[PDB]
Every structure is written in structure tokens, then in C-alpha cells.
Design a protein around this ligand. Structure first.
Ligand SMILES: *[C@@H]1O[C@H](CO)[C@@H](O)[C@H](O)[C@H]1NC(C)=O
Ligand SMILES: *[C@@H]1O[C@H](CO)[C@@H](O)[C@H](O)[C@H]1NC(C)=O
Ligand SMILES: *[C@@H]1O[C@H](CO)[C@@H](O)[C@H](O)[C@H]1NC(C)=O
Ligand SMILES: *[C@@H]1O[C@H](CO)[C@@H](O)[C@H](O)[C@H]1NC(C)=O
Ligand SMILES: *[C@@H]1O[C@H](CO)[C@@H](O)[C@H](O)[C@H]1NC(C)=O
Ligand SMILES: *[C@@H]1O[C@H](CO)[C@@H](O)[C@H](O)[C@H]1NC(C)=O
Ligand SMILES: *[C@@H]1O[C@H](CO)[C@@H](O)[C@H](O)[C@H]1NC(C)=O
Ligand SMILES: *[C@@H]1O[C@H](CO)[C@@H](O)[C@H](O)[C@H]1NC(C)=O
Lengths: 958, 280, 49, 49, 49
């Protein structure tokens, strides 16, 4: 029968205490939700490991073996009454040879048997209760140094289950104590890979890049030329007469099948040293043709025959180039004396040893001397592994349209890549292309909302991806994953798992080139074309105008970052630690650490300057009034309350609870860590920033706009709001007559902001992003200390205690180089991010000066509307501006005229427009409907009535 | 992060209107000819005529697609979130809302007003009475139309007024060319080809040669990313200024000296270009 | 720990669990009013008790 | 330019005058790597400033 | 003589044109910018000793 092993068979990976960490390891684990076999006694295979579980005592041991006869060793583990006995003898299934023996002195028993490097690891757990579904962790019992192959096993007596371990990656979760409580299998879904990549169990909403995909080759193409004759190395080596070193000869070897293995499989040769190749690799390479130089030389002059030597033979008799490819052979068995000048390479002038030098032409022409390899057929339009005369690779092969002149064998590109080649047999030109590759994105609506995902395979045609998935030939090969019937082609790549709708909405998750994704209606992941905005029609007419008849008060919010976290590092503690050889080895690099300390310290000083620039803009500390009701406008939620312990106001408390935050070494009683990292405190505390913003709000509500330029001047609040209504282009009666409505709208809008901040909607995402980026930079820096950069260990103390100093020098050099590079990367990225934060703080200072201390006429600078007044509130690492604006609401259509004509003179309006009431002609202001009688006090006269295009006849009162 | 920031820049400059106003049937408002800055219904494309000139002006390997090919060096170019048609739809709705509602849709809802009265209000806002418009309306319409024609003819003349967008194109291409050309150096190894090293040498010395090539190529990629971060900062500052100009000069009338042209500002119009915006 | 640092140990004689911490380190700043005004300083030892 | 980055001297003329070429290649490689890194750091920080 | 050339290859694959990079200042400029037609301006090419 068949069952399923859901989240079973997790064991401790090693013997190290860990707590409150997520640990991510690679070993032989039993995958989640894999198949098991239920036996309700076959010789079962033992491929790489098993998970044996037994639900009832019918099971008391096992027999692990190779052939299960008396022809090979076989370990037997069994449990008598109060004894566990292990023996490893040849058995009939009494003991012929043996070397190991060990005697020592419903509910579910779980075991894992793993065998590697001659050791049989055994793990064991227990749990009291078909196989139940759940999580249980297995502790090690004993490993045994018994060196036998185990390919079969059998139980000893039935209800037991058998799984199979495979090499996977798990992300284990450690408790507050040391116990493992949870794990994810990083090859079960796209989502499990996404959880392992961001190192968390809870995923937000969005699109994330996790890995890259490949298409793996299915085939193998070998092409070699038509050569059959065996190669005459007999006439060159086993020869009777050789010339002297001053008259060496050269023999050309071409059109043969060289073997080269009749040379290094014998001890016949005294020296065999090869430059540019190695001897074992010569049976696959192949060459144009080979030249052999045969001559006789003395005993202690064979050393002198090498690239770059001096003497008599290496200067007057025989010289090799510096770029020599080929090699020399001498075995045990006359020259120039005077010459004007030295020789040029491979040129001659016209106890004993016997020497032959072979020089290879490497493929500047057709190959002829090729080694003994077989040739297959062409496999076109398919990802294969090719081998054309020793030129290996991986890619696809297509017919090509290039015109090779008959001395060219292959083509090139600007990055030294071969992309076309001539077949050695049929002489047709083939193109070479890569197999498909690119990135993989995972689109998720949040793990709070669902556990479905969609996958984008970036920049690929995905008939290819569907074909490679269904044939199981894609490298990120997720086990429990199906393509489905939803495959959709985009310019971004293609989207597997999202369905195409035809209704357009605003963009939620941007996929690319017009396409978005969202989570709609039971629910599913859809994919649409984004709609750019709501639709309207506004009707142009040449004699109508629309004028507002009411207004509304709106308070909106703007969030600006001002500063970030100040950081210092100790180089000698980060790079070296407590060591004293590392310090001396690091002194050889100049002042890298004085330079780094200056860079980080200047960044920190700049952060303090940012905050002083934004907030310290007043010169006098105005006290908050005891009464916070100014003509109907309730200022209670933006000024501090005398009967609370803290200085922050209500909205500031909401903002500080809104942003949610270490363990690096900052002082908070305080500790410090082995990595050498610190966070330094700011010059201005939260209490002094809140005192600043309270003084600014108090001065606005009392003095107005006058304290920002000169001295503060008191003024009642309703007159201040009347002057601001003038400043946007409305007269003062519009406030003085409708004052109660304006006060009510102000109060209701303040209450709406407070309720929308309590609603826990994320509008403070900018300050959160500042926090998140700083933390991930420091996490990368600390995690870079676990790498070894080629050394034998990442720990300096193990290197220093396990090795002499002359090898510890080179291992500490590799570690020093890698760590200096990691620290330099951190400092460069901090400087670029500091520039960005300083631009944002410069803008926040301009907005405090022009929108809080004044009234700005710039469109959309502070708010969306006509600006009235603004309020600063302090946030963690930033400022929040609450802009009060003026919005006009209900419209009406009128008939309008540019000028009117009375007695032969044209009258124009001073400040306003002429409108038609429906009964008569009035004059009104543009931003509110208040009609007035047309008189000579609000008109002016210029010219006669024969030139304005659209003039009318009406009377003008006197 | 650089890739996401580019799309944020484009959304910040162009998506500044709530509602999509349809281009009017008639493009003649009191004598002012708007035919060259609004799209024509008798053509297959959404771009206007001046936008067509601008797109023909700039003269724009690695994998990318639109058939989908790849290169051995592992380099692609990703497509943007907003197509050229959507940016053209944005700038068309901005021109239409200006020519019909004037300045009132940057603060609330749009309110229609005849174009001559809108121009009289703008003349009043620079400090000139409205009768100066209403009595010399024909001359001002003629000067507007002649200036639009000279803008058209000076862009057809093939003068390099669009040097900034070309500079953007050139800097990006030469960065990627240097990155591909760095794959020919060997950095001390016997050859710059990994397959030659792996096919003609044993394991123990191939480790040394491959370590040298790995070190050099990591250094080349690090230089590319650091310089891309600095250039992204430049492009973000420039896009922030362009969003400030679209707010304060297209949706209003600015009193700031030399912010929006040289003179006394009346009104301004946006057109789309490759990787940019052109303000008239 | 996460940077391969051993921060606890079991005593091989009494089987008591011990904690390992670095002993104090940090930076040293020198506060001066100018050498032409005086020749006395103050020293800040950063981030320790 | 006064640092030697592991080589026997910070001077190329001393290395080239008192040593054969087969070891001078190693010492000059160490100096070349150190100086390339110094000049790269200068150019990066000039761009930011 | 040992010189440096910049060779132009056709679309078919034949050499059609070349510049001798040590004949003029302009030929050195063409080889350093890797093109045949230069724009207007001032360009840095090499260093003198
Ligand atoms: C014990 O092992 C040896 C070789 O290891 C073998 O020759 C011998 O036959 C074995 N003993 C018996 C009784 O077979
Ligand atoms: C060739 O001839 C010239 C003059 O006879 C001589 O100097 C030179 O050394 C000879 N050999 C070579 C290898 O050039
Ligand atoms: C090589 O041999 C093949 C047979 O395998 C033959 O078809 C082909 O024509 C030969 N080509 C040459 C160039 O000898
Ligand atoms: C303006 O709107 C308010 C409610 O927002 C209403 O009470 C008032 O009557 C309106 N004014 C007019 C003239 O309709
Ligand atoms: C001002 O607002 C606060 C907050 O709701 C409220 O408790 C207080 O009573 C108000 N003051 C009045 C109505 O005078
Ligand atoms: C015209 O104005 C009068 C007052 O002068 C007003 O009673 C009447 O309602 C107005 N006409 C219309 C159509 O509203
Ligand atoms: C507006 O300009 C276009 C382009 O020059 C022209 O064809 C059209 O006739 C003009 N409209 C008029 C004159 O009404
Ligand atoms: C390339 O070869 C073709 C012949 O197929 C010839 O017509 C053409 O002139 C050649 N040259 C170029 C530049 O295409």
C-alpha cells in the first residue's frame, strides 16, 4: 500500500546549541509530503537512507547488508531483553570473519539510518498515539565505524513504514530553548522557496525575485575528423641514430590517430614535464599537427632545455620560446663554443641522454592529429553538449548563413565567445546559441490572505518553458508543482498561475509593460491591463462658465524622512579580533581603517546637522496656552496635555506607536558584541524634538505668520483665517458669516485623521523603509564573517590553534583580504544612501519654512487645494506635515460675457466675471458664488464697443 | 532597486491627473490653433505631430525582446511599466484639460471657461489689464500660431536640441560595452576562456587559474553596480525637478523668475520624448 | 552565533554552563578648547559603563 | 604609495635592482594590486563628492 | 614595422577598410574612440613622455 509522510523525519543536524534563530542547512532529509510504503519480509533497498517507523513488539531489529549471504559482511542490530547487541560478521541468513561487536546495558518509534564515510549514523525519536500526521524531532544515538556497503535491509520479527532520504535544503526554526519546533522544505513549492529566500515564515504582498532558471541539456554531440591511420611514434622514439645538439632535426607528424598513452604509462623516461597542457588531458584535445625535435645532449644540460634558460646549449644550440605549448621527454642511454650573438627560438646554425621535444599547433587550421574518440550524429534545435575537435560547451545548434572562407574553422564575438563553427565531416556551418535562462519571480497576495502564488519566468518564450517543465528538464524543479491550464505571454516573460481578465483596474502588483496583478473574486490571482484613470468629459463652450457654490476643508498628510541611524565600526575587532598576528599582517595595507572611521564619522555628524536644520527654526520657545479653543477650532489633539506623563501630543503618540522596529551592540545598562559594531545616540532627544514642534504649533495658533519674519505679534484666530481667505482669493465676509461651518469642518477633519491613523493603515511606510534598509545592510555585514574566502576555516582561532605560523600567514591573508572588501562595500553604500537622506531633509526644511511659517502660492507644494495653514508633528526618524487646504465643491453653469456696453463705452470687470443669473446680469468672484450689482465702483472704462468680440448691451448703475 | 526606482520616477512626473479628459473635436479656441499639440483622429498612432518629431529625433549586444533571444554574457534589459501609448495618453489629457478648464483642475474638479477669458486672467496675473488682451486678441493669436510653427520647423531642421536624452542613451551603452569587454582579459591566468582552461589542464592547476578569473570578474561587476547607483541618483534628482515643473507651470501660473521660460510666464504644455519630457 | 562566534560552553569538570562575553572596548574621543586657548583636554570613552 | 601590501619593499626600483625576474613578478603583482585598489577608492569618493 | 591597425569587417566577413593608428593624431583619435567618423570637440587620447 501507499501512505504519505507529512512533516515527519526531522533530526538535529549537528551537536551545537542554538536558540531563537532560523537555521538553514543542507543534508539528507526526508522531503515533506513524500510517498512511503506500508507493510501490513521483503529485501527492501537502502538507496541513500531510510526513515523506518514502527507503530507496534513485532519489530526488534534490522539486518543491513550487501548480498545477504555468507559472501559479504553484514551488520545485525537486535534487542533482547535489556540488551542491545551489534555484530558485523559474515552470516548465513555462523560467523566466519568479523571485526566489530558492541554489547550495551500504542506508541510510535521513529528511526533514521544514514551511511556515509564508513560511519552508520542512527537517530531515534518516540511519540505516543496508518501513519499519523505531525511534526517530531529525532535525537542522535550512536554512529558506528563499520565500513561496509549497505544496499539492502530487512526487518526482524507487522506494521512498519519506509521512506527514503534525498539531499534537500531545510530551514529549521529553533525555540527560545534549544529545541527545533518548525521547518520548511525549500523545494516543495514556489512559496517554500520564497520563505527560505527572505529567511522568514510570514510573507507580505508583492513580487519578489528568488532564483534563476536553466534548461538542462538532453543529448551529447561529438564530431571528429575522418582519420584512421595509427600514428608513427615508433620511428621518432625507437630510432638508432640521433643528431647532435648543434644540428637537431625536425619531423612533422600529421594525419594520424595519436594515442599519447604509450608515453606516460611507462617508467622509461627520466623527465616528462609538460607546459601549457597536462599529460592526462592529451587524449581528448586535438591539434593541427605535431613537430618532434630529436637530438643528443649531456647529463647536467637537460635542466638547461626549458623555456627561459641560459648557458651554452640554451644560447647557441637550441632555444625554446617563452609561450611554449608542448612538452619534452628525455631518458638515459657536439655543440657550438664560439658564436657572435644568441639564437632566436626554434632556429639552428650549421652520462649521455636522449631527448625529444614535441610542439603542438593548436587549431589555426583543420585538425589532423586527433586522439581516439568516437563520433555521433548532429542533434539540431535542441539543448545538447557539443564537442567539435576538443572545443567543448553547451548550447543549441541551428543551420547558419555565414560564409566561411576556406581557411576559417570557427567564428568569434567581442567577449571571446564562439558562436559559429564548421562541421568537420559535412562542412556545414552551424550556429551556437545558449539554452534558455533568466530569473524567476514569485507573485503572492500575502501569506495572511492565501497560500497560492504565481510564477513569472522572465524574458523567455514559454512554449519552451512548458515543454521543459513537462519533460522534467528545468533546474528549479519544484516537486509538488503543476503548470496548470493558465499560461499567459507578456513582454516581461510569461506568467504561470494567473488568469487573464478583460476588466481594467488600478495597478496593485506591477508585472510589466502594461500588465498588473491583484487578488479578486472563491478568490484567485488575476492579471489585467492597468487603467490609467477614471473617465470624464468636459464640454468646451465659447459663452459658458462654471462657478463653485460651496467649499470644503480638507487636512492631508505628508511623511518625510530626516535622518537615519548612526553607526561606528572597530576594524581591528571586525577584521581581526583579539589576535596579534592579524594586527601585524593588517598593518601592511596602509591606513584603510583611519579612512573608514573618518567616512562613517562624517556621515554621523551629517545626520545631526539634518535634524537641526529641519526642526531648530524658531528662536523663542512659546508656551502652549492653557485654553485650546480658538473661536470654535479645537486644537486639543495637536498640542500637549498637561495631565499626561509625556510631552508628545495625541497624534504624536499614535505616530510613535505606528512604526515598529537590533542586537548589534548599542548602549540602551548595556552590552556589546564580538563583531565590533555599535549604534551611537543622537544629539537631540525625542523630548527636545517634541518641545520644538509644540512651540511651532503654539506660535502658529497665537501669533500667526508674523513670527517667521521678525517678531511675534498676537492676533485672534478668526482674523488670521480671514487674512488667509484673502490670500487664496476669497473675501473676508465668506469666513465671518460662515464661521461655524468652517470650525465644524476643521474639527471633523482632525478627528478623521486621528481615526485613520488608529486604523493601522500603512501611511508611515517611508520611515519603515529607512529602518528596514539600515537593518539589512548590517545583517549582510555580520553574515559576511561566516565565509572563509578560500581558507580552510572562517574562524581565526581554529586556524591559529591548528596550524604553524608559516601556513597561518597565508590563511589569515585570504581572510584579511575578503573582510576588508566586505567592509569597503558597506561604507560605499552608506555614503550613497546618506546623500539620498540629505536631499529629503533639505526638502523637509524648505516645507517647514514655506508652508508652516507662511502661506505658499506654489501649486501642489503643500497639499492638494489652496493652502491655508500647516502643522508639524514628529515621527521616528522624520516629520509629518498636516496641510489644511481649501476645496470648492458644488458647481453651476452660467452664461458669461467679456465686457458690457452702456453708452458707447466698454466696461470691464475689476476683479471677477460677468455672469447671467437667469434673469439679469451680475458680477461675481471666481472662487465662490456671491452675485453683486454691476456699478461704476467695480468696473472700469476703456474704449468704445466696436472691437471686443462678444460684447453685450446692459445698464450700469451709478 | 534601481529598476523599481525608474518606474517610480515616470509615475511621479506623468500620473498627475485624476481624470482623463477627451481631446476636443475642434482645435481652434478663439483663434489659437492647437492642431500640432493634440493627437489627430485620422492616424493610427496616439502621438501628436511634434511628439512624432521628438521620437524620430533620438537615435536609440545583450538580450532583450518585444521573438526572444539571449546572449552568452547573461545581460538583459527589462521593459517599463508604462508604455509609450500610456505616456502619450497622459500628455494628451493634460493638454486637453488645460485648453478646456485652464487652471482649476489642479485644485479640485475641472471647471470650463472660454479660452479668451482664461488668457485675460493670465494677462491680469502678470500685471497687465484685460482690455489689452480683448482689444488686441487677433494679433496675440497670430503671434501664438507663428511661434508654434517656428517650434515645429526648428525641430525638423535637425538641430541637436535633444542632447540630454542622447547623453542618457550614450552613457548607459558605454557602461555595458565596458562590462562586456572586461570578459576578454585574463587577469594573470593562461587564457580568458574557462573552457580552454578546463579542457587542457588538470584539476589542481585549473583551481588556480579559475580563482584568478573569478577575482577579476567579481571586481568588474562591483565597479558596474557602484557607478549605476551614482547615476541613478542623478536621474532621480532630475525627475524630481520635472515633477515640480509639471505641478507649478502646467497646472498653474508661476511667479518665480526664470523658472518656466525667460519672460513673464503665461501657460505651458507637456510633450513626451524618449526617456524624458519636453516643456513648451 | 550567526557570525560563527561561540558564546556559551559546558565546563568539562562540573558540567556548568558558562557565558562568554568580550571585555570592554570602544573608541576614545578628545575634547579640546583649542591649543592656543589652553593645554587641557577631556576624554570621552564611548559606550561603556 | 609608501605601503608595500606584503611585498619586500614599497619601491619598485629596489625590487627590480636586487631580484631576478621570476620573483620580481610576484612582488610587483602585490604592489600593482594594492595601488589599483587605492586609485579606485579615490575615483569613487570623488564621484560622490 | 610593428604597428597597430583597426580593421573593419564586412557583414559578409571580408576586410573592407582600416586605419593606421600611428600615422596622424586623427588616426589615433579614431582608434581610441573606436569609430571612423568623429564629432566636434576636444578629446583626450593618450599620454606623452
Ligand atoms: C577470514 O577472512 C579471510 C580474508 O579476510 C579469508 O581468507 C578466510 O577464509 C576467512 N575465514 C574463513 C573461516 O573463511
Ligand atoms: C643570422 O645572421 C646575422 C648576421 O649574419 C646574425 O647576427 C644572427 O645572429 C644570425 N642568427 C639569427 C638567429 O638571427
Ligand atoms: C567523412 O566520413 C563520413 C562518413 O562518416 C563521410 O560521409 C564524409 O563525406 C567524410 N568527409 C570527409 C571530408 O572526409
Ligand atoms: C455647503 O455644504 C455644507 C455641508 O458641507 C452645508 O451645510 C451648506 O448648507 C452648504 N452650503 C450651501 C449654500 O448649500
Ligand atoms: C476638543 O477635542 C477633544 C478630543 O475629542 C475633546 O475631548 C474635547 O472635549 C474638545 N473640546 C471641546 C469640545 O471644548
Ligand atoms: C435671479 O436673481 C433673483 C434675485 O435677484 C433670484 O430670486 C432668482 O432666483 C435668480 N434666478 C434664478 C434662475 O435663480
Ligand atoms: C491649424 O494648423 C494646421 C497645421 O498647420 C493647419 O493645417 C490648419 O489649417 C490650422 N487650422 C486653421 C487654420 O483653422
Ligand atoms: C556579400 O555577398 C553577397 C553575395 O551573396 C553580395 O551580393 C554582396 O555584395 C556582398 N557584400 C555585402 C556588403 O553585402
Amino acid at each position: 500500500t501507499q501512505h504519505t509522510s507529512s512533516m515527519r523525519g526531522v533530526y538535529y543536524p549537528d551537536e551545537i546549541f542554538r536558540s531563537d534563530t532560523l537555521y538553514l542547512t543542507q543534508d539528507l532529509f526526508l522531503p515533506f509530503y513524500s510517498n512511503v510504503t506500508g507493510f501490513h519480509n521483503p529485501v527492501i533497498p537502502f538507496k541513500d537512507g531510510i526513515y523506518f517507523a514502527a507503530t507496534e513488539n513485532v519489530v526488534r531489529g534490522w539486518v543491513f547488508g550487501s548480498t545477504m549471504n555468507n559472501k559479504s559482511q553484514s551488520v545485525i542490530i537486535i534487542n533482547n531483553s535489556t540488551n542491545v547487541v551489534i555484530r558485523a560478521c559474515n552470516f548465513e541468513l555462523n560467523a566466519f570473519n568479523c571485526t566489530f561487536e558492541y554489547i550495551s546495558d500504542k506508541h510510535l518509534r521513529e528511526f533514521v539510518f544514514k551511511n556515509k564515510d564508513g560511519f552508520l549514523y542512527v537517530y531515534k525519536g518516540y511519540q505516543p498515539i496508518d501513519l499519523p500526521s505531525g511534526f517530531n524531532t529525532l535525537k542522535p544515538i550512536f554512529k558506528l565505524p563499520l565500513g561496509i556497503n549497505i544496499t539492502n535491509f530487512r526487518a526482524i520479527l507487522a506494521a512498519y513504514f519506509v521512506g527514503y532520504l534525498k539531499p534537500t535544503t531545510f530551514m529549521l526554526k529553533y525555540d527560545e530553548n534549544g529545541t527545533i519546533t518548525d521547518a520548511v522544505d525549500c523545494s516543495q513549492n514556489p512559496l517554500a522557496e520564497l520563505k527560505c529566500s527572505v529567511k522568514s515564515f510570514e510573507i507580505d504582498k508583492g513580487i519578489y525575485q528568488t532564483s534563476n532558471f536553466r534548461v538542462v541539456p538532453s543529448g551529447d554531440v561529438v564530431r571528429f575528423p575522418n582519420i584512421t591511420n595509427l600514428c608513427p611514434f615508433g620511428e621518432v622514439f625507437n630510432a638508432t641514430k640521433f643528431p647532435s645538439v648543434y644540428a637537431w632535426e625536425r619531423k612533422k607528424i600529421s594525419n594520424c590517430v595519436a594515442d599519447y598513452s604509450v608515453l606516460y604509462n611507462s617508467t622509461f623516461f627520466s623527465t616528462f614535464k609538460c607546459y601549457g597542457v597536462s599529460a592526462t588531458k592529451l587524449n581528448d584535445l586535438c591539434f593541427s599537427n605535431v613537430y618532434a625535435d630529436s637530438f643528443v645532449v649531456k647529463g647536467d644540460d637537460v635542466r638547461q632545455i626549458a623555456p627561459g634558460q641560459t648557458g651554452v646549449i640554451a644560447d647557441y644550440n637550441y632555444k625554446l620560446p617563452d609561450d611554449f605549448m608542448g612538452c619534452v621527454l628525455a631518458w638515459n642511454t657536439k655543440y657550438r663554443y664560439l658564436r657572435h650573438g644568441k639564437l632566436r627560438p626554434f632556429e639552428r646554425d650549421i652520462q649521455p641522454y636522449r631527448v625529444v621535444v614535441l610542439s603542438f599547433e593548436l587549431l589555426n587550421a583543420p585538425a589532423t592529429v586527433c586522439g581516439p574518440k568516437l563520433s555521433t550524429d548532429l542533434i539540431k534545435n535542441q539543448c545538447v553538449n557539443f564537442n567539435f575537435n576538443g572545443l567543448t560547451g553547451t548550447g543549441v545548434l541551428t543551420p547558419s548563413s555565414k560564409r566561411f572562407q576556406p581557411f576559417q574553422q570557427f567564428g568569434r564575438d567581442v567577449s571571446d565567445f564562439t558562436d559559429s563553427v564548421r562541421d568537420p565531416k559535412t562542412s556545414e556551418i552551424l550556429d551556437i546559441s545558449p539554452c534558455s535562462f533568466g530569473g524567476v519571480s514569485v507573485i503572492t497576495p500575502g501569506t495572511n490572505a492565501s497560500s497560492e502564488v504565481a510564477v513569472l519566468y522572465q524574458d523567455v518564450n514559454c512554449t519552451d518553458v512548458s515543454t521543459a517543465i513537462h519533460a522534467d528538464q528545468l533546474t528549479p524543479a519544484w516537486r509538488i508543482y503543476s503548470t496548470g491550464n493558465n499560461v499567459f505571454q507578456t513582454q516581461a516573460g510569461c506568467l504561470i498561475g494567473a488568469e487573464h481578465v478583460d476588466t481594467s483596474y488600478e495597478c496593485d502588483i506591477p508585472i510589466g509593460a502594461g500588465i498588473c496583478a491583484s487578488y479578486h473574486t472563491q478568490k484567485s490571482i488575476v492579471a489585467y491591463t492597468m487603467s490609467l484613470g477614471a473617465d470624464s468629459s468636459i464640454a468646451y463652450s465659447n459663452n459658458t462658465i462654471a462657478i463653485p457654490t460651496n467649499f470644503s476643508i480638507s487636512i492631508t498628510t505628508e511623511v518625510m524622512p530626516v535622518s537615519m541611524a548612526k553607526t561606528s565600526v572597530d576594524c581591528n575587532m571586525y577584521i581581526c579580533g583579539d589576535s596579534t598576528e592579524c594586527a601585524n599582517l593588517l598593518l601592511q595595507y596602509g591606513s584603510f581603517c583611519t579612512q573608514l572611521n573618518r567616512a562613517l564619522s562624517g556621515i554621523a555628524a551629517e545626520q545631526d546637522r539634518n535634524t537641526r536644520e529641519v526642526f531648530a527654526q524658531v528662536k523663542q520657545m512659546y508656551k502652549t496656552p492653557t485654553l485650546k479653543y480658538f473661536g470654535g477650532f479645537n486644537f486639543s489633539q495637536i498640542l500637549p496635555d498637561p495631565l499626561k506623563p509625556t510631552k508628545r501630543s495625541f497624534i504624536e503618540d499614535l505616530l510613535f506607536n505606528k512604526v515598529t522596529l537590533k542586537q548589534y551592540g548599542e548602549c540602551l545598562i548595556c552590552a556589546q558584541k564580538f563583531n565590533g559594531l555599535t549604534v551611537l545616540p543622537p544629539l537631540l532627544t525625542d523630548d527636545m524634538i517634541a518641545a520644538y514642534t509644540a512651540a511651532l504649533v503654539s506660535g502658529t495658533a497665537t501669533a500667526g505668520w508674523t513670527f517667521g519674519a521678525g517678531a511675534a505679534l498676537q492676533i485672534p484666530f478668526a482674523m488670521q483665517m480671514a487674512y488667509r481667505f484673502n490670500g487664496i482669493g476669497v473675501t473676508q465676509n465668506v469666513l465671518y458669516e460662515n464661521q461655524k461651518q468652517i470650525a465644524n469642518q476643521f474639527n471633523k477633519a482632525i478627528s478623521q485623521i486621528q481615526e485613520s491613523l488608529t486604523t493601522t493603515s500603512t501611511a508611515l511606510g517611508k520611515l519603515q523603509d529607512v529602518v528596514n534598509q539600515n537593518a539589512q545592510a548590517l545583517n549582510t555585514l555580520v553574515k559576511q564573517l561566516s565565509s572563509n574566502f578560500g581558507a580552510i576555516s572562517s574562524v581565526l582561532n581554529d586556524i591559529l590553534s591548528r596550524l604553524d605560523k608559516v601556513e597561518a600567514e597565508v590563511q589569515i591573508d585570504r581572510l584579511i583580504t575578503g573582510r576588508l572588501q566586505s567592509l569597503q562595500t558597506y561604507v560605499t553604500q552608506q555614503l550613497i544612501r546618506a546623500a539620498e537622506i540629505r536631499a529629503s531633509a533639505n526638502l523637509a526644511a524648505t516645507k517647514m519654512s514655506e508652508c508652516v511659517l507662511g502661506q505658499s502660492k506654489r501649486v501642489d507644494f503643500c497639499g492638494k487645494g489652496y493652502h491655508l495653514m500647516s502643522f508639524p508633528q514628529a515621527a521616528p526618524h522624520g516629520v509629518v506635515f498636516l496641510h489644511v487646504t481649501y476645496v470648492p465643491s458644488q458647481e453651476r453653469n452660467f452664461t458669461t460675457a467679456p465686457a458690457i456696453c452702456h453708452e458707447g463705452k466698454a466696461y470691464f470687470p475689476r476683479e471677477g466675471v460677468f455672469v447671467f443669473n437667469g434673469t439679469s446680469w451680475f458680477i461675481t468672484q471666481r472662487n465662490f458664488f456671491s452675485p453683486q450689482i454691476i456699478t461704476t465702483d467695480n468696473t472700469f472704462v476703456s474704449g468704445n464697443c466696436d472691437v471686443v468680440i462678444g460684447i453685450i448691451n446692459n445698464t450700469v448703475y451709478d
